[PDB]
């Protein structure tokens, strides 16, 4: 009969559940706490930013680059053909996930003046150096030598992807909302 076979299984099974129920909260306390889960959007004043200036802002513990691009930056970015890019995805949270990495899909505005992106190298997370550094008139990551162009697209080095573009939109004439 199944009276003496079932107790040694049922008892141990309860013990297995009890151990698991005790171990999960010891792991999950290391997952982001409610203060971290609750972090919301921010707003950045940009009226003081002339073309050729990069504004660097902290958001979720990482840098966000807000660059008002010059004419040269925009021309170089638009002159690159899709087949010449290492990573052909726009990496833009504001549009379709499949959009192409054309210079138009890498800026917030149609004029292509406002480049907003995570200043977080897609290799291992370092901060690329801005202004006009590297071999593509863009950003240079000093950690292992990745070069980004004037639209923030990866062109050379270990980094696999273009610098991601966060959710970003102009709330009024002079303020951008990140997040």
């Amino acid at each position: 009969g199944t009276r003496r076979d079932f107790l040694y299984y049922a008892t141990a099974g309860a013990g297995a559940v009890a151990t698991g129920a005790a171990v999960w909260p010891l792991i999950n306390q290391m997952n982001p706490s409610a203060d971290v889960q609750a972090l919301a959007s921010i707003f950045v004043d940009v009226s003081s930013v002339e073309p050729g200036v990069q504004l660097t802002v902290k958001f979720l513990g990482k840098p966000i680059f807000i660059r008002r691009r010059t004419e040269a930056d925009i021309e170089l970015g638009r002159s690159v053909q899709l087949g010449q890019l290492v990573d052909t995805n726009a990496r833009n949270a504001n549009i379709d996930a499949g959009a192409e990495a054309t210079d138009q899909n890498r800026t917030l505005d149609e004029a292509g003046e406002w480049l907003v992106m995570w200043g977080v190298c897609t290799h291992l997370g370092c901060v690329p150096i801005g202004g006009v550094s590297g071999d593509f008139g863009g950003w240079f990551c000093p950690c292992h030598g990745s070069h980004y162009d004037s639209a923030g697209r990866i062109r050379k080095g270990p980094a696999p992807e273009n610098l991601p573009i966060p959710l970003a939109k102009f709330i009024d004439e002079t303020t951008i909302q990140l997040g």
Partner: peptide, 13 residues
């Protein structure tokens, strides 16, 4: 990565 970091980035956590 998030579990080790306790957030989106290296921080106090």
């Amino acid at each position: 990565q998030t579990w080790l970091l306790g957030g989106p980035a290296v921080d106090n956590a």
